[PDB]
Amino acid sequence: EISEIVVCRRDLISFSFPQLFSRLADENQNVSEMGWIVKIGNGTRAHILPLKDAIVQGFNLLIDSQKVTLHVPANATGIVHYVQESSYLYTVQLELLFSTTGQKIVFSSHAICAPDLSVACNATHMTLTIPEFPGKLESVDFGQWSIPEDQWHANGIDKEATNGLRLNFRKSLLKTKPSEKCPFYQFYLSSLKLTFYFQGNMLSTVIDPECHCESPVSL
Amino acid sequence: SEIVVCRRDLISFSFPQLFSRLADENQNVSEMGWIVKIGNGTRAHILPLKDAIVQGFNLLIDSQKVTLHVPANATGIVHYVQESSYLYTVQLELLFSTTGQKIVFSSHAICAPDLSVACNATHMTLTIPEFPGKLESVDFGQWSIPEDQWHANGIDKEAGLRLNFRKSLLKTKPSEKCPFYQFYLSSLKLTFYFQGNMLSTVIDPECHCESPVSLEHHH
Ligand SMILES: *[C@@H]1O[C@H](CO)[C@@H](O[C@@H]2O[C@H](CO)[C@@H](O[C@@H]3O[C@H](CO[C@H]4O[C@H](CO[C@H]5O[C@H](CO)[C@@H](O)[C@H](O)[C@@H]5O)[C@@H](O)[C@H](O[C@H]5O[C@H](CO)[C@@H](O)[C@H](O)[C@@H]5O)[C@@H]4O)[C@@H](O)[C@H](O)[C@@H]3O)[C@H](O)[C@H]2NC(C)=O)[C@H](O)[C@H]1NC(C)=O
Ligand SMILES: *[C@@H]1O[C@H](CO)[C@@H](O[C@@H]2O[C@H](CO)[C@@H](O)[C@H](O)[C@H]2NC(C)=O)[C@H](O)[C@H]1NC(C)=O
Ligand SMILES: *[C@@H]1O[C@H](CO)[C@@H](O)[C@H](O)[C@H]1NC(C)=O
Ligand SMILES: *[C@@H]1O[C@H](CO)[C@@H](O)[C@H](O)[C@H]1NC(C)=O
Ligand SMILES: *[C@@H]1O[C@H](CO)[C@@H](O)[C@H](O)[C@H]1NC(C)=O
Ligand SMILES: *[C@@H]1O[C@H](CO)[C@@H](O)[C@H](O)[C@H]1NC(C)=O
Ligand SMILES: *[C@@H]1O[C@H](CO)[C@@H](O)[C@H](O)[C@H]1NC(C)=O
């Protein structure tokens, strides 16, 4: 269903599009008679940049025969930010345009990044808080298969809407790892995929939530 | 770069694939995913290719070229009739789309195949209906004669719009249509400052056929 690869990173979101019908080369930028434009956001909230200015801001465009990759700084204007109860998620609606005389090629993708979700843990459960945003959670995938809502409870997943969206996981589902940051171990999940009904489509985010200590150690 | 061919009942747009290879052998292409738009802004009439084909549009493609035939009765064409002279414009956007990628071919044609053409002893005279185009250049072949040189080169403007050409600028030929000879021009390009842009029409204006004198024969 999805062909581009979206990766949320610390300071950066990477979009990689395959060249299904385009024949663009790395040379075809910063050259006469052709131009790249980066748009982030929707409608009047959409922020438009010529590639030159975007490069100055820390964007990077990479092209080879197989794919077109755009690295987007997480503070790019047009990103929509959702903070609630110290939990943080943001969305990136990208349109990347190559234009020549009488022709345009447009790569489109809408990313959900949620590295700073608030994660609380007690004796029996891990609890994620997901800020309210246009996405409605419809599936949770630990790796093997995509668990729909009507099967969450049986598989140890419990949703609570008393405030915002709290997603609970039985401690039995959690992995353990040693840690020197939250001494001397912490529970966590690896490559948890959350899928949302987001503005009429299915869109996922991948996260590695870990329980947090009140005061962690760091030098 | 695109080729626009205006006929009475049909306008042909042929686009090169300079930076794409859409419809190459490793791809399967269908009428699905194609959209035809004719007109500007909210006057643009949008058809899926399936419906446009019903109406008499025709799309033919290979990896090197994309050709769209647009019926002259297409919804969205702007029609200009004045003083028995007829000119019309076709603002085309042709889109091929996948879920995350699209290519858009754009061209704005000015067609005047049925422009009214009158000729007398000394001049050919074209009548151009009033429309958003301001005539700025006339190109017979080699170079684009701007307004400030028209009079010197035998071109005189008269006011919707009458454009006079001294007969010295005209070619002559016999034809099965005009067995003696006729004055004419081939691939005359008129260039207009059109809504902040440059737009041209190419036309083949012809005088009525010349009349030969009777020859007496055997008696
Ligand atoms: C076939 O059709 C022709 C047009 O459809 C028609 O030509 C017109 O005929 C009338 C009546 O005979 C003439 O009327 C006379 O006009 C002059 C005006 O002087 C000049 O006008 C034009 C262009 O003027 C341009 O001037 C500035 C720069 O100076 C430009 O920016 C701008 O383009 C203006 O339009 C010019 O062509 C004239 O040319 C002269 O020289 C030739 C040489 O043989 C002559 O043939 C021509 O008749 C004229 O003498 C001239 O420089 C005015 O002073 C008079 O009092 C009179 O009113 C039009 O000028 C003439 N127009 C053109 C473009 O030729 C033909 O008459 C018609 N033929 C028949 C048989 O019906
Ligand atoms: C650990 O936290 C979870 C959720 O954050 C608590 O689970 C809920 O507890 C309330 C009562 O406090 C019940 O009404 C809900 O049905 C529980 N939901 C789930 C999914 O278990 C749990 O009680 C907390 N445990 C402790 C010891 O505080
Ligand atoms: C996005 O912008 C378009 C205008 O380009 C508007 O019609 C649409 O309602 C916007 N979507 C949202 C969710 O605001
Ligand atoms: C935005 O992020 C870039 C790196 O992605 C960084 O260099 C820059 O200082 C940041 N600007 C602000 C205002 O945070
Ligand atoms: C086109 O579709 C056919 C099925 O009708 C499939 O067998 C073939 O592999 C496709 N061609 C290419 C080049 O992918
Ligand atoms: C063409 O449409 C755009 C909106 O797509 C509008 O802003 C503009 O005014 C229109 N131009 C003309 C000449 O009507
Ligand atoms: C429009 O013109 C095309 C030919 O260019 C023809 O096939 C079609 O029937 C015409 N439509 C109408 C409504 O006359």
XYZ file of C-alpha atoms and ligand atoms in Angstrom:
608
model
C 0.000 0.000 0.000
C 2.953 2.288 0.799
C 5.911 2.738 -1.556
C 7.941 5.551 0.029
C 10.030 5.006 3.164
C 9.489 7.550 5.936
C 11.914 7.516 8.873
C 11.493 9.795 11.881
C 14.908 10.634 13.327
C 16.094 12.782 16.229
C 16.330 16.094 14.341
C 15.169 14.990 10.923
C 12.469 13.232 8.896
C 13.652 11.287 5.846
C 11.356 10.719 2.868
C 12.537 8.300 0.158
C 10.482 7.922 -3.018
C 11.141 5.293 -5.691
C 11.469 6.565 -9.244
C 8.463 4.784 -10.699
C 8.247 6.852 -13.902
C 10.779 9.630 -13.358
C 14.351 9.690 -14.655
C 15.763 12.430 -12.451
C 19.493 12.636 -11.742
C 21.479 14.242 -8.929
C 22.723 16.787 -11.486
C 19.189 18.096 -12.158
C 19.182 20.678 -9.350
C 20.596 24.183 -8.944
C 20.621 24.235 -12.767
C 19.002 26.608 -15.240
C 15.531 25.937 -16.716
C 14.597 23.575 -13.829
C 13.789 23.962 -10.133
C 12.853 22.066 -6.978
C 10.256 23.320 -4.484
C 9.505 21.930 -1.004
C 6.029 22.482 0.477
C 5.126 21.415 4.017
C 1.597 21.714 5.363
C -1.887 22.140 3.969
C -3.628 25.156 2.441
C -2.835 28.496 4.068
C -0.792 26.662 6.709
C 1.425 25.322 3.902
C 4.948 26.757 3.901
C 6.679 26.945 0.503
C 10.441 27.005 -0.041
C 12.656 27.000 -3.122
C 15.197 24.222 -2.716
C 18.057 26.727 -2.385
C 16.535 28.264 0.741
C 15.569 24.824 2.049
C 19.182 23.663 1.746
C 20.263 26.703 3.757
C 17.740 25.652 6.429
C 19.227 22.148 6.685
C 17.147 20.195 4.164
C 19.066 17.850 1.896
C 17.978 16.357 -1.432
C 19.665 13.210 -2.741
C 18.875 11.569 -6.074
C 20.060 8.381 -7.720
C 18.641 6.192 -10.464
C 16.442 4.297 -7.997
C 14.997 6.889 -5.619
C 14.635 10.514 -4.551
C 15.327 11.250 -0.878
C 14.551 14.452 1.034
C 15.849 14.993 4.585
C 13.572 17.443 6.418
C 14.633 19.227 9.637
C 12.139 18.706 12.450
C 11.870 22.486 12.978
C 10.880 23.163 9.368
C 7.977 25.587 9.142
C 4.738 23.834 8.244
C 5.156 20.873 10.575
C 2.097 20.539 12.811
C 2.936 20.007 16.474
C 0.684 18.347 19.054
C 1.640 18.624 22.728
C -0.673 17.429 25.493
C 0.128 16.429 29.069
C 3.861 16.456 28.290
C 3.307 14.063 25.358
C 4.500 15.178 21.936
C 3.657 14.082 18.399
C 4.040 15.933 15.107
C 2.963 15.479 11.487
C 4.743 16.405 8.256
C 2.670 16.863 5.081
C 5.305 16.988 2.331
C 4.937 17.917 -1.315
C 8.239 17.828 -3.215
C 7.997 19.328 -6.712
C 10.375 19.262 -9.654
C 9.332 21.756 -12.325
C 10.481 22.366 -15.878
C 8.806 24.241 -18.710
C 5.317 22.805 -19.059
C 5.912 19.858 -16.715
C 5.913 19.054 -13.014
C 6.778 15.919 -11.074
C 5.421 15.835 -7.537
C 6.274 13.423 -4.717
C 3.770 13.469 -1.826
C 3.866 11.867 1.631
C 2.413 12.558 5.088
C 4.506 11.395 8.077
C 3.613 10.888 11.752
C 6.542 11.159 14.173
C 6.053 10.523 17.858
C 9.460 10.016 19.514
C 8.509 12.010 22.644
C 5.248 10.263 23.543
C 4.839 10.297 27.297
C 5.318 6.783 28.651
C 4.366 5.887 32.219
C 4.801 2.495 33.842
C 3.579 0.879 37.045
C 3.647 -2.666 38.422
C 1.200 -4.058 35.856
C 1.106 -1.879 32.726
C 2.904 0.460 30.384
C 0.785 3.472 29.424
C 1.308 5.644 26.349
C -0.422 8.997 26.080
C -1.141 10.015 22.484
C -2.039 13.706 22.015
C -5.362 14.441 20.391
C -4.864 14.948 16.664
C -6.693 14.149 13.409
C -5.495 10.520 13.572
C -7.863 7.867 14.908
C -5.958 4.803 16.108
C -7.185 1.675 14.328
C -4.369 -0.897 14.632
C -1.417 -1.823 16.841
C 1.349 -4.007 15.369
C 4.098 -5.468 17.569
C 5.776 -7.091 14.558
C 3.917 -10.231 13.565
C 0.470 -8.884 12.618
C -1.763 -5.799 12.697
C -4.126 -6.123 15.681
C -7.428 -4.276 15.046
C -9.337 -2.468 17.765
C -11.833 -5.260 18.430
C -8.942 -7.594 19.383
C -6.810 -5.269 21.542
C -8.140 -6.338 24.948
C -7.584 -10.051 24.306
C -3.975 -9.336 23.280
C -3.285 -7.218 26.375
C -3.995 -3.770 24.884
C -6.538 -1.512 26.584
C -7.649 1.902 25.343
C -8.859 4.651 27.661
C -10.411 7.946 26.574
C -11.144 9.531 29.981
C -8.710 12.213 28.808
C -7.088 12.335 25.386
C -5.976 8.835 24.415
C -4.164 6.528 26.834
C -2.993 3.187 25.436
C -2.191 0.493 28.016
C -0.026 -2.602 27.535
C 0.164 -5.554 29.919
C 3.613 -5.878 31.455
C 3.679 -9.378 29.927
C 3.995 -7.767 26.488
C 7.037 -5.716 27.484
C 10.659 -6.629 26.895
C 13.403 -5.935 29.400
C 16.837 -4.510 28.730
C 19.613 -3.399 31.060
C 20.075 0.334 31.379
C 22.541 2.683 33.018
C 20.272 5.673 32.264
C 17.366 4.336 34.361
C 19.415 2.003 36.563
C 19.608 -0.902 36.157
C 16.933 -1.970 33.684
C 13.801 -0.709 31.977
C 10.819 -2.195 30.182
C 10.256 -1.199 26.576
C 8.833 -2.151 23.197
C 10.697 -2.342 19.905
C 9.359 -1.220 16.521
C 5.797 -0.771 17.747
C 3.714 0.316 14.753
C 0.584 2.366 15.408
C -1.792 2.809 12.465
C -4.296 5.672 12.319
C -7.251 6.586 10.148
C -5.783 9.984 9.284
C -7.703 12.368 7.000
C -9.339 9.576 5.022
C -6.259 7.340 4.738
C -4.255 4.797 6.707
C -1.027 6.210 8.123
C 1.369 4.608 10.573
C 4.029 5.691 13.014
C 6.785 3.448 14.359
C 8.017 3.996 17.912
C 10.237 2.391 20.549
C 8.536 3.399 23.803
C 10.379 2.735 27.046
C 9.392 3.239 30.657
C 11.035 6.294 32.182
C 12.624 6.862 35.567
C 11.676 10.056 37.396
C 15.272 11.328 37.440
C 17.601 9.675 34.891
C 21.375 9.792 35.048
C 23.308 11.631 32.352
C 26.686 13.329 32.176
C 8.936 22.086 -26.034
C 5.445 20.681 -26.518
C 3.837 20.572 -29.942
C 0.396 22.155 -30.197
C -1.567 21.553 -33.393
C -4.851 23.428 -33.744
C -7.543 22.175 -36.091
C -11.170 23.233 -36.399
C -12.491 20.177 -34.553
C -9.409 19.069 -32.599
C -6.387 20.344 -30.682
C -3.371 18.045 -30.387
C -0.862 18.383 -27.548
C 2.331 16.329 -27.772
C 4.673 16.439 -24.762
C 8.249 15.123 -24.671
C 9.343 12.997 -21.724
C 12.510 14.901 -20.876
C 12.751 13.756 -17.248
C 10.337 10.792 -17.205
C 9.975 7.416 -18.889
C 6.297 6.869 -18.189
C 4.744 3.942 -20.103
C 8.143 2.245 -20.514
C 8.108 -1.537 -21.016
C 8.612 -2.357 -17.332
C 5.356 -0.523 -16.546
C 1.704 -1.293 -17.196
C -0.360 1.847 -17.763
C -4.138 2.204 -17.855
C -6.609 5.034 -18.328
C -6.953 4.920 -14.548
C -4.931 7.549 -12.734
C -5.173 10.050 -15.616
C -7.015 13.349 -15.214
C -7.737 16.000 -17.856
C -8.313 19.593 -16.723
C -9.325 22.373 -19.136
C -9.636 25.983 -17.999
C -8.292 28.148 -15.216
C -8.971 28.055 -11.500
C -12.613 27.460 -10.686
C -13.453 27.571 -14.405
C -11.340 24.451 -14.911
C -13.429 21.431 -15.854
C -11.976 18.198 -14.505
C -12.552 14.811 -16.109
C -11.104 11.386 -15.411
C -9.637 10.114 -18.652
C -12.345 7.436 -18.802
C -15.054 10.103 -19.094
C -12.942 12.307 -21.378
C -12.523 9.425 -23.823
C -16.314 9.121 -23.970
C -16.417 12.808 -24.983
C -13.912 12.372 -27.836
C -10.581 12.949 -26.113
C -7.808 10.539 -27.051
C -4.563 9.801 -25.170
C -1.606 8.015 -26.791
C 1.685 7.470 -24.951
C 5.051 5.754 -25.013
C 8.226 6.274 -22.972
C 9.293 9.207 -25.162
C 6.086 11.159 -25.796
C 2.610 11.873 -24.442
C -0.065 12.989 -26.933
C -3.552 14.188 -25.985
C -6.243 14.993 -28.567
C -8.791 17.482 -27.208
C -12.084 18.048 -29.046
C -12.676 21.707 -29.859
C -16.077 21.365 -28.126
C -14.414 20.434 -24.821
C -15.863 22.002 -21.695
C -13.527 24.686 -20.358
C -12.348 26.075 -23.706
C -12.699 29.865 -23.884
C -14.284 31.122 -27.089
C -13.765 34.544 -28.696
C -15.973 35.581 -31.635
C -15.935 39.088 -33.095
C -16.374 40.543 -36.605
C -16.731 37.115 -38.242
C -13.362 36.124 -36.728
C -13.006 33.197 -34.314
C -10.226 32.428 -31.842
C -10.269 30.101 -28.844
C -7.923 29.138 -26.014
C -7.364 25.775 -24.339
C -5.638 25.763 -20.928
C -4.675 22.111 -20.461
C -3.442 20.309 -17.373
C -2.856 16.594 -17.977
C -2.112 14.571 -14.816
C -0.975 11.005 -14.267
C -1.166 10.111 -10.587
C -0.309 7.305 -8.222
C -1.012 7.408 -4.502
C 2.234 9.255 -3.761
C 3.586 10.527 -7.100
C 2.261 12.483 -10.057
C 3.410 14.012 -13.335
C 1.613 17.078 -14.719
C 1.843 18.249 -18.321
C 0.695 21.846 -18.854
C 0.113 23.843 -22.021
C -2.086 26.795 -22.955
C -3.002 26.818 -26.623
C -4.300 29.728 -28.683
C -6.088 28.430 -31.760
C -7.216 30.624 -34.652
C -7.637 28.298 -37.646
C -10.803 30.175 -38.628
C -9.350 33.641 -38.117
C -10.898 35.958 -40.697
C -8.437 36.827 -43.478
C -9.038 39.450 -46.171
C -6.686 40.522 -48.951
C -6.585 43.369 -51.416
C -4.209 44.742 -54.054
C -1.527 45.803 -51.560
C -2.097 43.990 -48.249
C -3.277 40.936 -46.378
C -5.343 41.851 -43.315
C -6.006 39.611 -40.310
C -8.777 40.389 -37.818
C -7.975 39.122 -34.312
C -10.833 38.978 -31.760
C -10.354 40.885 -28.526
C -8.972 38.612 -25.812
C -6.468 38.724 -22.918
C -3.535 38.583 -25.369
C -1.653 41.773 -26.244
C 0.156 41.248 -29.546
C 3.870 41.868 -28.972
C 5.689 39.966 -31.743
C 5.197 38.601 -35.254
C 7.514 35.814 -36.456
C 7.369 34.602 -40.074
C 10.470 32.429 -39.839
C 13.825 33.326 -38.450
C 13.339 36.027 -35.829
C 10.661 37.635 -33.689
C 9.860 41.137 -34.955
C 8.797 43.218 -31.916
C 6.173 45.937 -32.083
C 8.644 48.803 -32.520
C 9.801 47.349 -35.877
C 6.457 46.366 -37.441
C 5.949 49.436 -39.641
C 9.505 49.302 -40.988
C 9.050 45.638 -41.945
C 5.667 46.138 -43.630
C 3.450 45.321 -40.620
C 0.783 47.843 -39.618
C -1.637 47.557 -36.703
C -5.166 48.981 -36.941
C -8.032 48.835 -34.439
C -11.189 44.383 -32.649
C -7.640 44.074 -33.975
C -6.668 44.408 -37.635
C -3.130 43.377 -38.582
C -1.991 44.373 -42.076
C 0.891 42.816 -44.019
C 2.258 44.334 -47.211
C 2.039 41.779 -50.015
C 5.843 41.774 -50.315
C 5.934 39.675 -47.115
C 3.639 36.984 -48.573
C 4.532 33.760 -50.329
C 2.797 32.627 -53.507
C 2.087 29.116 -54.731
C -0.131 27.213 -57.140
C -2.262 24.544 -55.470
C -4.929 22.092 -56.543
C -7.139 24.472 -54.551
C -5.841 27.567 -56.373
C -4.670 26.265 -59.784
C -3.278 29.666 -60.845
C -1.742 31.001 -57.637
C -2.600 32.465 -54.235
C -0.844 34.617 -51.673
C -0.396 32.948 -48.289
C 1.746 32.497 -45.194
C 2.881 29.247 -43.577
C 3.474 28.785 -39.841
C 3.086 32.474 -38.999
C 3.658 32.846 -35.249
C 1.883 35.587 -33.299
C 3.180 36.042 -29.751
C 1.088 37.704 -27.037
C 1.735 39.061 -23.558
C -0.994 36.941 -21.973
C -1.814 37.394 -18.272
C 1.783 38.076 -17.321
C 3.143 35.331 -19.598
C 4.138 34.752 -23.214
C 1.737 32.714 -25.352
C 1.811 32.165 -29.105
C -0.472 30.947 -31.865
C 0.709 29.504 -35.181
C -1.542 30.066 -38.203
C -1.549 29.568 -41.990
C -3.501 32.553 -43.345
C -4.514 32.431 -47.015
C -5.921 34.900 -49.513
C -8.686 33.850 -51.881
C -7.363 32.375 -55.109
C -6.145 34.679 -57.857
C -8.103 34.621 -61.113
C -6.355 34.055 -64.466
C -7.410 35.703 -67.727
C -9.242 33.766 -70.424
C -7.168 32.337 -73.273
C -8.834 32.053 -76.670
C -8.672 28.650 -78.350
C -9.075 26.933 -81.712
C -11.928 28.110 -83.929
C -5.760 47.458 -48.752
O -5.868 47.432 -47.358
C -4.969 48.320 -46.674
C -5.263 48.153 -45.206
O -6.337 47.243 -45.006
C -5.161 49.765 -47.141
O -4.084 50.535 -46.626
C -4.548 51.778 -46.159
O -5.166 52.579 -47.170
C -5.587 53.868 -46.701
C -6.329 54.529 -47.839
O -5.593 54.462 -49.053
C -4.373 54.663 -46.229
O -4.832 55.913 -45.723
C -3.775 56.897 -45.636
O -2.993 56.725 -44.461
C -1.916 57.674 -44.255
C -1.181 57.274 -42.961
O 0.244 57.230 -43.219
C 0.937 55.932 -42.892
O 0.086 54.907 -42.354
C 0.496 53.481 -42.388
C 0.935 53.043 -40.996
O 1.072 54.182 -40.119
C 1.862 53.768 -38.911
O 2.682 54.790 -38.425
C 3.412 54.538 -37.190
C 4.864 54.935 -37.491
O 4.878 56.067 -38.373
C 3.304 53.032 -36.701
O 3.677 52.945 -35.322
C 1.883 52.390 -36.881
O 2.029 51.053 -37.367
C 0.985 53.185 -37.800
O 0.012 52.243 -38.281
C 1.588 53.210 -43.435
O 1.518 51.857 -43.876
C 1.400 54.126 -44.604
O 2.154 53.613 -45.753
C 2.271 54.569 -46.895
O 3.182 54.135 -47.893
C 2.732 53.123 -48.851
C 3.812 53.019 -49.909
O 3.245 52.437 -51.079
C 1.359 53.494 -49.444
O 0.882 52.426 -50.244
C 0.372 53.774 -48.318
O -0.929 54.024 -48.847
C 0.885 54.926 -47.477
O 0.979 56.040 -48.377
C 1.764 55.539 -44.142
O 3.171 55.519 -43.824
C -2.522 59.107 -44.209
O -1.480 60.076 -44.109
C -3.372 59.384 -45.480
O -3.961 60.696 -45.426
C -4.430 58.287 -45.711
O -5.430 58.435 -44.709
C -3.622 53.882 -45.156
O -2.403 54.538 -44.830
C -3.295 52.473 -45.647
N -2.687 51.685 -44.586
C -1.635 50.884 -44.782
C -1.156 50.121 -43.580
O -1.087 50.783 -45.876
C -5.149 49.871 -48.658
O -5.553 51.172 -49.069
C -6.096 48.856 -49.264
N -6.042 48.919 -50.714
C -7.110 49.164 -51.477
C -6.863 49.189 -52.956
O -8.225 49.362 -50.994
C -1.441 0.873 36.652
O -1.964 1.721 35.648
C -3.115 1.179 34.982
C -3.501 2.170 33.908
O -2.619 3.284 33.888
C -4.248 0.920 35.976
O -5.260 0.186 35.296
C -6.609 0.712 35.488
O -6.966 0.896 36.863
C -8.288 1.426 37.048
C -8.463 1.657 38.531
O -7.433 2.487 39.049
C -9.321 0.464 36.468
O -10.621 1.026 36.603
C -9.016 0.199 35.000
O -9.903 -0.791 34.491
C -7.575 -0.277 34.834
N -7.258 -0.465 33.427
C -6.397 -1.388 32.988
C -6.191 -1.443 31.504
O -5.809 -2.145 33.754
C -3.763 0.102 37.168
O -4.764 0.085 38.178
C -2.479 0.686 37.752
N -1.972 -0.169 38.814
C -1.613 0.287 40.018
C -1.122 -0.745 40.990
O -1.678 1.479 40.310
C -6.316 21.672 3.055
O -6.284 22.780 2.160
C -7.328 22.765 1.178
C -7.077 23.940 0.259
O -5.896 23.757 -0.509
C -8.683 22.829 1.876
O -9.714 22.741 0.901
C -8.813 21.690 2.879
O -10.018 21.833 3.621
C -7.623 21.680 3.838
N -7.695 20.529 4.726
C -7.812 20.628 6.053
C -7.865 19.333 6.806
O -7.876 21.715 6.623
C 16.480 23.974 13.461
O 17.126 22.725 13.265
C 18.393 22.846 12.605
C 18.879 21.442 12.327
O 17.836 20.617 11.824
C 19.345 23.651 13.483
O 20.579 23.822 12.797
C 18.739 25.010 13.807
O 19.557 25.696 14.748
C 17.330 24.857 14.377
N 16.713 26.163 14.551
C 15.895 26.475 15.563
C 15.362 27.877 15.564
O 15.597 25.664 16.438
C 1.523 -6.289 -16.950
O 0.425 -7.008 -16.414
C 0.452 -8.410 -16.688
C -0.885 -8.968 -16.256
O -1.919 -8.585 -17.153
C 1.627 -9.013 -15.945
O 1.668 -10.411 -16.206
C 2.913 -8.359 -16.430
O 4.003 -8.807 -15.631
C 2.846 -6.826 -16.360
N 3.978 -6.260 -17.072
C 5.006 -5.653 -16.473
C 6.091 -5.158 -17.382
O 5.055 -5.504 -15.255
C -6.685 31.556 -12.602
O -7.033 30.781 -11.491
C -6.347 31.137 -10.288
C -6.713 30.095 -9.259
O -6.351 28.796 -9.704
C -6.759 32.542 -9.886
O -6.038 32.919 -8.719
C -6.456 33.513 -11.016
O -7.023 34.780 -10.700
C -7.042 33.026 -12.346
N -6.556 33.856 -13.436
C -7.355 34.444 -14.331
C -6.666 35.256 -15.385
O -8.577 34.329 -14.290
C -17.227 16.934 -29.876
O -16.305 16.740 -30.944
C -15.872 15.383 -31.125
C -14.908 15.393 -32.289
O -13.826 16.289 -32.069
C -17.069 14.467 -31.369
O -16.622 13.117 -31.361
C -18.131 14.652 -30.294
O -19.303 13.931 -30.650
C -18.483 16.125 -30.137
N -19.453 16.304 -29.069
C -20.660 16.845 -29.265
C -21.536 16.949 -28.054
O -21.027 17.236 -30.371
